[PDB]
Design a protein around this ligand. Structure first.
Ligand code: K
Ligand code: K
Ligand code: K
Ligand code: K
Ligand code: K
Ligand code: K
Ligand code: K
Ligand code: K
Ligand code: MG
Ligand code: MG
Ligand code: MG
Ligand code: MG
Ligand code: MG
Ligand code: MG
Ligand code: MG
Ligand code: MG
Ligand code: MG
Ligand code: MG
Ligand code: MG
Ligand code: MG
Ligand code: MG
Ligand code: MG
Ligand code: MG
Ligand code: MG
Ligand code: MG
Ligand code: MG
Ligand code: MG
Ligand code: MG
Ligand code: MG
Ligand code: MG
Ligand code: MG
Ligand code: MG
Ligand code: MG
Ligand code: MG
Ligand code: MG
Ligand code: MG
Ligand code: MG
Ligand code: MG
Ligand code: MG
Ligand code: MG
Ligand code: MG
Ligand code: MG
Ligand code: MG
Ligand code: MG
Ligand code: MG
Ligand code: MG
Ligand code: MG
Ligand code: MG
Ligand code: MG
Ligand code: MG
Ligand code: MG
Ligand code: MG
Ligand code: MG
Ligand code: MG
Ligand code: MG
Lengths: 33, 224, 88, 160, 128, 87
RNA sequence: AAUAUUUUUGU
RNA sequence: CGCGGCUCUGAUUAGUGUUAAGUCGAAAUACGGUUCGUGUAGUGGAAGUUGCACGGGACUUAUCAAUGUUGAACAAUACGA
RNA sequence: GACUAAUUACGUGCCAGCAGUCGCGGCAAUACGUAAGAGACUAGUGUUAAUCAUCAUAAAUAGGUUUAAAGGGUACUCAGACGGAAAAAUUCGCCCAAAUAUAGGGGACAAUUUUUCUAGAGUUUUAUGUAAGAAGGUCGUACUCUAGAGUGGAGAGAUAAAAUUCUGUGAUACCUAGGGGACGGGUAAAGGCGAAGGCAAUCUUUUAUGUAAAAACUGACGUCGAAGGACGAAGGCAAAGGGAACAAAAAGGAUUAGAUACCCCAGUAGUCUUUGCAGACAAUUAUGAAUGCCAUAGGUUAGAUUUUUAAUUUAGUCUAUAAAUGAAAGUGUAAGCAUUUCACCUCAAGAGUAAGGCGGCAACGCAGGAACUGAAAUCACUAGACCGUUUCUGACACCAGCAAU
RNA sequence: AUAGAUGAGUUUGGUGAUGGCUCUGAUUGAACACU
């Protein structure tokens, strides 16, 4: 896999890792950890 | 694939087919090249086929998976061991120049080593001692050392006379009014002078050069 | 210790600067002048003999260029023989 | 086993691809069977078993091998003479069919079809120059020999 | 290391097929149907390759290593945890072969009782 | 390419020495006694197991090495690989 | 030889 | 009647796809102007950026201070660009 | 319009519309709408939907995974597939050979089994060599802390330049005497060692493989290996220690249009020790492990043999090639010719995401879709252009000088 | 059953690959539009 295409996966995994933090407390209230 | 498709061995097969028929259908084929019939009955030889090379020494029998089965082997004779023993005992025998340029290849036809060291066509050198030693060692059933001594002493008696001739031949020529040129001892010394002088020029030039480096280390530009 | 390796196949076996680069000699004399001023002084008498040498240097004519070195030509003859071969 | 015939098929190709005059093969009852078929078919020159070193080429046929007992059976080997003609090997391809993972058995009714350039089963038709070897009760024969003897068996390899 | 090669000499002297062929009553396996015993050539040296000697030598290495892994700081040696698993598995493949080859011969029972090799050493799967 | 070089460095050095017309004599320890080298008594390499030490002084070509000359490592290799396997 | 200011954008 | 499954719907709320013509920066591709990516842990409106180890899909992209030689005289009927 | 057999004119002007795919239409459109001509099928003709084939496009026949979708982090290993030599019994597998063939024949191969064999795989004979691993201890250069009311007496350190900062409560610099933690200079190499991860000061202790040479011994005991279990870098969580140095965070000073940043003054977790959890990596040779085999050369590592000078030779590793192979780059102890076996792939994007579930203290890991939207995504190479890219070549391009705006 | 195995348009500045999509062939217990 080229480096240009690897950066497409890099942006997807970061925005997801960044999303699971923001909604971590909300998922803890509903018992969805 | 840096190589190219060489079809040099099929120039006949290819030319024979291109000349069998005519491109213009309905006409007889024109005459073929002048060389098509000359090599009609002289096909090429088989190339690029690795055979089992000639074995100049008994191959290792204990090897169960031997390699290099298609590698030419070294040519070693019984004389190779004798040449090394002699020339090592007589290192300066190599300084005596020897010509390895053959004239017609028919040199081994007049060599009868049952007569002595002096043979026809070849000079008296360490080889004549080796060939004489190998003969006595094989025919007369002598040992390596026994044959070596006999063939080695005959070599000295012949070389001694050679050095005695140079001395007497010159001394004999002057007794009747015969003069010669510059001997090798004098010419050799004159050459050293021309070289020694050139070294002296190089020494004085570098010596003076180093003085500048010694003085340039310290600084005295102020001129106190 | 190991011996020199057999160079890989190169495009060209050559030396960048065949003929040595000559350094301006008068630049060395100037450095000596600047040394006196640093230690002795500017309007002094110790730099007299050194300042004169700097004027005589710039006045003298520069040497002539030396004949180019033919090293790169001989390196190109024995490249394929000395190295692994030529690459391109 | 069939693994030996597969190794023999690959090696004979690599040897012909390298344009080697002689070729060695492990001395086995199965390898000698196919070797005799290749020789009887005209692909290899001769077959003589010997030690780890090839016999004297000058007296290949006249070579008198020593008995094969348990004291030397581990060192014996089959020495095959490869053939090259018209700047081209005579045993170019030796593609196998029956591999250790699967043994392909063909019937007489199918070999009769494969012998005339028509597929049958997991095989394909034979074209000009091709050749198919079959291991049967009467030895490792050729598809045209097995068709004449009216027998089927195990397909070993296809030779071009 | 000195005991290692001194024990290897004990194993060859205790389980050596050249010593057990006479010290045991029925060392060899019982003959099969139609099979008759024949004389075989004598050995030119000590028997050091038989499964009995090897299984004993692996038992000497398993004890020296398993004892070093249970000593002080032995848990921290996480790289030799594989060395032990490879000695017990290597011994499992020789016991699994010698079992069917010896067909319950007396020479096979002398090795088990002497070394204490229970069925858990070769019969199942060794998971350490 | 044929890696060659001029051979006069040793070819003429032999012709110079032979121009002095002097033989080679056995070394003498310090009554000058210049004995020739090529003589049937001294210049001999073949021998038999009958000759004792009294004749070994004449020979010049020995098969064994000179102990005092060999290095400590070259001596070890001799003792182990040439002497030990001869008992 | 071991040096390093800043300098974005283009339907 | 209870438990479990399943379908629909749900204030509120999240992600992603598409849509030439908006705004804010300029992260990548050249040494991309702080080498870029992998993992992991933080951090920032956003792309990003920071620590730690790792990869080259980046430096094999490498090209002389060994400065390069009186290596056996000369003359002859030998030798003759 | 081309695929697809068959042309012009006028009108329309990215509007109206056409379209199965690529596409056409922006004022002289063979592609739209009319008129004419032309090409074809015909009581049928087109369109929509569907199925097969196209598609080797889930490849049993018959694929593929270095750089294009796709090799598991690792190999010990249960099951399971596959696997020598020369004979024999049994099955009658396989073949004659079927019709799901009674009963026979043939014996190469196949399955179970038996007896022998040594070429595979193993054992012994302290190899040599070696940063695999572990325990208990130490050594040293530098750093840092304390003290000597030391010497000396105004600056130091930082950066491209500075500022925050240090210093008259005596700093930096130069010493003396006590400590205190972690680090590993040279040697050092294309070198080596382990299953991988990874392992480089030193002593003792301790542990499994591997390699060379000969002999001896066992006698196919072998390879691969789902799952389980074990091991698994840095970072991280948990507990107790340690804390010199470095340094996420937090915080300040500059740079800048702005600057969270790159740079700087300082600095907590953390890095280290011990006991557990955790299991993700460009865990890489972007190349699973293993067997058989194919022509040379130049280095290099640990051995062996020898006429130990220098050449043979075994097992590794690294460059450059031949045949060959490949999309090519290139490989050429393999990315070749073959084989075994496991894992994995089936257009892009959504997505390694959602839901339920499992593991974990947590962080997260394992497993793993579909809807919506597309006709392309994607690889290597070729020639250019560009480079706050290298080395050069021309030009008042620049420097310098004079004149001018 | 021995004649039975076939391609085309489309990614790129361009070449060669990879990999889809679409057309070409046959058909329906078919529907619709114009007849
Ligand atoms: K590169
Ligand atoms: K049978
Ligand atoms: K002080
Ligand atoms: K190794
Ligand atoms: K710091
Ligand atoms: K664990
Ligand atoms: K090599
Ligand atoms: K989703
Ligand atoms: Mg990929
Ligand atoms: Mg530790
Ligand atoms: Mg633009
Ligand atoms: Mg709602
Ligand atoms: Mg960046
Ligand atoms: Mg940028
Ligand atoms: Mg950058
Ligand atoms: Mg990074
Ligand atoms: Mg911050
Ligand atoms: Mg780059
Ligand atoms: Mg047309
Ligand atoms: Mg297009
Ligand atoms: Mg129209
Ligand atoms: Mg009709
Ligand atoms: Mg891998
Ligand atoms: Mg895993
Ligand atoms: Mg992975
Ligand atoms: Mg039967
Ligand atoms: Mg036996
Ligand atoms: Mg034996
Ligand atoms: Mg063996
Ligand atoms: Mg040792
Ligand atoms: Mg003071
Ligand atoms: Mg310390
Ligand atoms: Mg590594
Ligand atoms: Mg070091
Ligand atoms: Mg295995
Ligand atoms: Mg597993
Ligand atoms: Mg950790
Ligand atoms: Mg930790
Ligand atoms: Mg803590
Ligand atoms: Mg700040
Ligand atoms: Mg650690
Ligand atoms: Mg790693
Ligand atoms: Mg595997
Ligand atoms: Mg290495
Ligand atoms: Mg290479
Ligand atoms: Mg291939
Ligand atoms: Mg996908
Ligand atoms: Mg997953
Ligand atoms: Mg989930
Ligand atoms: Mg280019
Ligand atoms: Mg101008
Ligand atoms: Mg100006
Ligand atoms: Mg004006
Ligand atoms: Mg392009
Ligand atoms: Mg394709």
């Amino acid at each position: 896999i080229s480096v240009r295409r690897q950066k497409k996966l890099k942006i997807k995994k970061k925005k997801y890792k960044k999303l699971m933090r923001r909604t971590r407390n909300e998922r803890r209230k509903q018992d969805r950890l | 694939g840096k190589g190219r498709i060489f079809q040099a061995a099929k120039v006949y097969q290819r030319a024979s087919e291109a000349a069998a028929t005519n491109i213009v259908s309905g006409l007889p084929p024109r005459n073929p090249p002048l060389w098509l019939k000359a090599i009609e009955s002289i096909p090429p030889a088989e190339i690029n086929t690795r055979p089992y090379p000639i074995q100049h020494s008994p191959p290792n029998p204990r090897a169960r998976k031997p390699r290099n089965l298609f590698r030419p082997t070294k040519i070693v004779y019984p004389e190779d061991e004798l040449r090394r023993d002699f020339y090592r005992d007589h290192p300066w025998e190599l300084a005596r120049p020897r010509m390895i340029i053959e004239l017609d290849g028919k040199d081994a036809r007049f060599l009868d080593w049952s007569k002595g060291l002096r043979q026809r066509g070849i000079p008296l050198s360490g080889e004549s001692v080796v060939q004489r030693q190998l003969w006595l060692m094989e025919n007369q059933g002598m040992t390596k050392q026994e044959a070596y001594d006999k063939a080695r002493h005959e070599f000295y008696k012949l070389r001694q006379l050679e050095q005695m001739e140079r001395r007497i031949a010159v001394e004999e020529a002057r007794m009747v009014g015969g003069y010669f040129g510059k001997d090798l001892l004098t010419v050799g010394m004159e050459l050293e002078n021309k070289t020694y002088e050139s070294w002296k020029k190089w020494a004085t030039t570098e010596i003076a050069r180093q003085e500048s480096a010694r003085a340039s280390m310290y600084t005295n530009v102020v001129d106190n | 210790p190991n011996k020199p390796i057999r160079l890989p196949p190169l495009k060209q076996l050559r030396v960048r600067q065949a003929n040595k680069a000559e350094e301006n000699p008068c630049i060395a004399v100037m450095s000596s002048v600047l040394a006196c001023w640093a230690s002795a002084g500017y309007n002094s008498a110790g730099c007299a003999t050194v300042e004169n040498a700097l004027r005589a240097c710039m006045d003298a004519p520069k040497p002539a260029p030396k004949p180019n070195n033919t090293i790169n030509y001989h390196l190109s003859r024995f490249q394929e023989r000395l190295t692994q071969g030529k690459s391109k | 086993g069939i693994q030996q015939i597969t190794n023999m098929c690959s090696h004979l190709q690599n040897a012909s691809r390298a344009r080697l005059g002689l070729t060695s093969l492990p001395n086995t009852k199965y390898n000698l069977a196919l070797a005799l078929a290749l020789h009887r078919a005209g692909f290899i020159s001769s077959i003589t078993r010997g030690g780890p070193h090839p016999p004297t080429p000058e007296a290949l046929m006249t070579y008198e091998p020593e008995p094969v007992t348990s004291a030397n059976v581990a060192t014996r080997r089959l020495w095959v003479g490869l053939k090259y003609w018209n700047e081209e090997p005579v045993l170019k391809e030796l593609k196998p069919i029956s591999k250790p993972s699967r043994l392909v058995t063909a019937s007489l009714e199918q070999l009769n079809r494969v012998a005339r350039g028509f597929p049958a089963g997991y095989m394909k038709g034979l074209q000009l120059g091709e050749c198919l070897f079959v291991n049967t009760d009467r030895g490792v024969l050729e598809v045209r020999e097995a068709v004449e003897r009216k027998v089927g068996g195990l397909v070993l390899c296809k030779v071009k | 290391k000195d005991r290692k090669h001194a024990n290897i000499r004990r194993c060859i002297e205790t389980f050596g097929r050249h010593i057990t062929d006479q010290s045991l009553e029925r060392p060899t396996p019982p003959l099969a149907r139609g099979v008759e015993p024949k004389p075989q050539p004598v050995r030119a040296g000590p028997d050091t390759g038989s499964s009995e000697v090897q299984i004993a030598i692996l038992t000497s290495k398993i004890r020296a290593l398993s004892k070093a892994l249970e000593g002080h700081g032995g848990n921290r040696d996480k790289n030799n945890k594989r060395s032990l698993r490879r000695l017990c598995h290597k011994r499992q493949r020789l016991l699994r072969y010698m079992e069917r080859k010896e067909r319950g011969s007396g020479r096979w029972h002398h090795m088990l009782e002497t070394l204490g090799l229970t069925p858990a050493t070769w019969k199942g799967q060794i998971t350490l | 390419i044929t890696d060659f070089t001029s051979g006069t460095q040793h070819g003429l050095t032999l012709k110079k020495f032979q121009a002095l017309n002097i033989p080679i004599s056995t070394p003498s320890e310090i009554r000058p006694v210049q004995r020739s080298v090529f003589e049937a008594d001294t210049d001999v390499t073949a021998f038999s197991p009958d000759e004792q030490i009294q004749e070994a002084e004449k020979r010049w070509k020995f098969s064994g090495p000179w102990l005092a000359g060999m290095t400590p490592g070259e001596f070890k290799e001799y003792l182990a690989k040439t002497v030990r396997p001869k008992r």
